[PDB]
Design an enzyme around this catalytic site. Structure first.
Site, PDB file in Angstrom:
ATOM      1  N   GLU A 109      25.716  19.450  37.069  1.00 21.06           N
ATOM      2  CA  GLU A 109      24.889  18.361  36.842  1.00 21.06           C
ATOM      3  C   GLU A 109      25.745  17.103  37.347  1.00 21.06           C
ATOM      4  O   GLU A 109      26.845  16.805  37.025  1.00 21.06           O
ATOM      5  CB  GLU A 109      24.819  18.154  35.018  1.00 21.06           C
ATOM      6  CG  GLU A 109      24.267  19.528  34.708  1.00 21.06           C
ATOM      7  CD  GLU A 109      22.958  20.123  35.031  1.00 21.06           C
ATOM      8  OE1 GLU A 109      22.040  19.548  35.507  1.00 21.06           O
ATOM      9  OE2 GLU A 109      23.106  21.414  34.801  1.00 21.06           O
TER      10      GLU A 109
ATOM     11  N   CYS B 264      24.713   8.392  34.330  1.00 21.46           N
ATOM     12  CA  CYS B 264      24.253   9.223  35.450  1.00 21.46           C
ATOM     13  C   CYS B 264      23.006   8.716  36.362  1.00 21.46           C
ATOM     14  O   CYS B 264      22.988   8.804  37.235  1.00 21.46           O
ATOM     15  CB  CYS B 264      24.240  10.853  35.095  1.00 21.46           C
ATOM     16  SG  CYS B 264      25.674  11.186  33.850  1.00 21.46           S
TER      17      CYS B 264
END
Ligand SMILES: CCCCCCCCCC=O
Ligand SMILES: [Cl-]
Lengths: 487, 488
Positions: free
Chosen positions: B246, B280
């Protein structure tokens, strides 16, 4: 039946070197053509990329409509495609027809898989209105194996096309004919230009396709060695999705059965179906040492020695056919040669039935105390290991770095429950042949048999990626602002 | 209340590697000191986690779930102290650190739902017999944690992996070791058996030993795309180990055709500066239509961004955002916007260091409408604006990146959102909600250089357990129609 590459809707001769496909028993040419060259491959990918922009825009219902029309064409031509499979691999007609029926069955189940695993769903959630749909990757290279030259390539192509990908199909140089006939059927189905592209060839062609910087995914069915080479090549390029479906070193346990022949049937199926060329074929048979086991091997060796082996189109059909080539049969004879010289003992001798052919008889070797190599392979050569405690069966079952199929024949459900609890394998059967699997379930091994991209029912998972949305309807201030926000 | 100790096989012990500290990004005071796990500390964590796996995989799902829920009850019981440790060690204001803990808790019921839908147990009668599908854990999984959400993101791997029967060796970010120690203590009070979870603090030396250890069965990574790619190359040739990545992104937010100016300026501020731009999914590139209606938007957007408050995590009235993770990071963020201006961009709002040796940055907005900047992920409150003409020109700009995590549009015109959805290559795509908005009830993963097709959140189950499919009969016995060539 022309030998041509197929690119952006056009049959054209390949620019690469000519090769041929030969019938594994008669040795005569069944297919000849030119391998796709570097620039042919580049052209298939570049055109597949172009077609992708429009093919992804079709509705799911439009893409599915073409796919089922392809299915209807499979039905209309079932026997002719079965005849091509039989010609080019050696698989008997009775069993080639089985592959075609599975190609057809792949279609409705892929449609189900797509809507359940990579479908479209909607919710009212904390952060707003939530929407999930899935997206195709782009151009996916599909590499086909030679053992199931229709069903297995089809097992990638249908889910991939259904999701909106386009495909560059590189079949094995041992089964180009079956592939060319299959792509002709996709064409008759009305698939747009560039959505599927056929690039025949051997090792050069595959390398050019594998390394092409414009493929978005690669789906591989084939040898564990080459799949590991592929995985290392892709190391550092997580942007491209890689799906690897590899072989195995599959064990079958037989302990405590009340129906002698019934077990000998499932045991024979597991090891020798398709002349032992199914990826999930039992290669190591685990039988209890001593009295309660010895009769099984005797009836099994008795019945295995009556297995019939002949040409794919024999006047009455044989159970199994030739191995893929006279060469393959050659190392299979060397394989069992190495074993006995190693200390194993022959229960039933694998013999080459006709001078320079791939027609092999079933072979059974007992290596109970002998150390053999942990190696995947195709062929009707079954090795037996005898054991004492069922905990010893489990230990031997897991004595491999592969992990595809595993199984037990037994009346005692709890011996199966222990296997399931302990074995590290993708398909695990109780009182069914190892070669039996359900396209309505995932089909993938762990360990050296995959990269955690199981196929069949779960192929949907690697054919489309998720896109998740929080929707509002109009951007507007919330009731409670966060500190520091001054309007 | 915090020792600095590695946690291995149920025992808190001093690490054998070199000492380091975790320092408060504003105050500079030591908040955590301890020893990095050494090569052999890491090896022991892995060998023990491997040993524990044998029994933990044998517990029922209901038994594993019961412990994980006890962990959730303990999160609730200690909400404020875990929020305080998050805020103290990252700089994130308390008001939002509390939000991270709420996300750790929400992670649990949603992981249980995910597990039963994506990697559960089902049965059918089919042609080949009675069909049964089960899922199995992988074994020992190394979890590498980030510093931006040092509880929520690591928890997004650990809850699904533990629930599925895996054991964990947790290597947290060397910038947020305290948060991890406190979290692992809650796992202990929860009753997790010895070795089922293992804490191995350290920096890059520790991480390499774990990532490279030949006995982990899986590696779950959240962090920089550069390191995630090194890991992927490390695993090249080892398909047996499952790798889940990720990674970051270069996320565009489009704003065209909004009738509620402030409402649109609010979502745009959230998108770019929440958590000081260390989420993110933060907007890094703001794409605005050239001319009249957009000039007003950028003007209002600059005005309100300049009244954003930035202070200590525990300020008497809470600030909107806090310090970036460290003075070094702030240093590199200031160098980034300098390069932009030196490249030809023009400054709409100057990002300023609010206090000399801290990570306190004021929001920064740069217009690079004609300038070519690098395709680079980063954490920090520095937003670049591009002006555009046709909406097709917005689309081409949004996709002008090798990343693919988030993308979004503020607009009244649903069909502008529909075109974005049809064209954008991104994992999360929002309409009239901040880019920082995500749902744990849905998959959470970027494409391109932002992932490896193992999205987390709802789909984390997919990489936490593998399928085992069975055809059952009950007694091996010949079929009604035999195959030719089997003589009895
Ligand atoms: C990367 C760990 C999974 C956490 C997903 C939470 C959504 C924000
Ligand atoms: Cl759609």
């Amino acid at each position: 039946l022309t030998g041509n590459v197929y690119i952006d809707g056009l049959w054209l001769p390949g620019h690469g070197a000519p090769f041929e496909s030969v019938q594994p028993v008669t040795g005569e040419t069944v297919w000849d053509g030119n391998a796709a060259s570097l620039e042919d491959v580049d052209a298939a990918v570049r055109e597949a990329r172009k077609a992708f922009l429009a093919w992804r825009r079709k509705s799911l219902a439009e893409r599915q409509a073409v796919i089922e029309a392809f299915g209807e064409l499979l039905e209309a031509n079932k026997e002719e495609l079965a005849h091509q499979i039989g010609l080019e691999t050696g698989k008997p007609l009775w069993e080639s027809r089985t592959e075609v029926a599975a190609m057809m069955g792949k279609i409705p189940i892929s449609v189900k898989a797509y809507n359940e695993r990579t479908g479209h769903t909607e919710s009212d959630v904390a952060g707003g209105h939530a929407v999930l749909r899935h997206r195709p990757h782009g151009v996916v290279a599909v590499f086909g194996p030679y053992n199931f030259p229709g069903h297995l390539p089809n097992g990638h192509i249908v889910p991939a096309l259904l999701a909106g990908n386009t495909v560059v199909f590189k079949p094995s140089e041992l089964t180009p004919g079956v592939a060319e006939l299959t792509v002709r059927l996709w064409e008759k189905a009305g698939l747009p230009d560039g959505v599927i592209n056929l690039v025949q060839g051997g090792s050069d062609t595959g390398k050019c396709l594998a390394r092409h910087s414009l493929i978005d995914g690669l789906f591989f069915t084939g040898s564990s060695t080459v799949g590991h080479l592929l995985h290392e090549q892709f190391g550092g390029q997580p942007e491209k999705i890689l799906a690897l479906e590899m072989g195995g070193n599959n064990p079958l346990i037989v302990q405590n059965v009340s129906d002698l022949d019934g077990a000998v049937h499932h045991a024979l199926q597991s090891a020798f179906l398709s002349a032992g060329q199914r990826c999930t074929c039992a290669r190591r048979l685990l039988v209890p040492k001593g009295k309660k086991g010895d009769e099984f091997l005797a009836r099994l060796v008795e019945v295995a020695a009556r297995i019939t082996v002949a040409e794919f189109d024999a006047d009455p059909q044989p159970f199994m056919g030739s191995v893929i080539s006279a060469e393959a049969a050659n190392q299979l004879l060397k394989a069992q040669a190495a074993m006995l010289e190693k200390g194993a003992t022959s229960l039933l001798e694998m013999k080459q039935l006709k001078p320079d052919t791939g027609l092999l008889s079933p072979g059974i070797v007992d290596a109970t105390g002998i150390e053999l190599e942990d190696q995947e392979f195709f062929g009707p050569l079954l090795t037996v290991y005898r054991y004492k405690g069922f905990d010893e069966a489990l230990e031997l079952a897991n004595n491999t770095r592969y992990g595809l199929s595993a199984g037990i024949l037994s009346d005692d459900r709890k011996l199966y429950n222990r296997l399931v609890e302990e074995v590290r394998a993708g398909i695990v059967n109780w009182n069914r042949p190892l070669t039996g699997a359900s396209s309505a379930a995932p089909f993938g091994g762990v360990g050296a048999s995959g990269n955690h991209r199981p196929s069949a029912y779960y192929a949907a998972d690697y054919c489309a990626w998720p896109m998740a949305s929080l929707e509002a309807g109009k951007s507007e201030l919330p009731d409670s602002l966060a500190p520091g926000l001054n309007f």
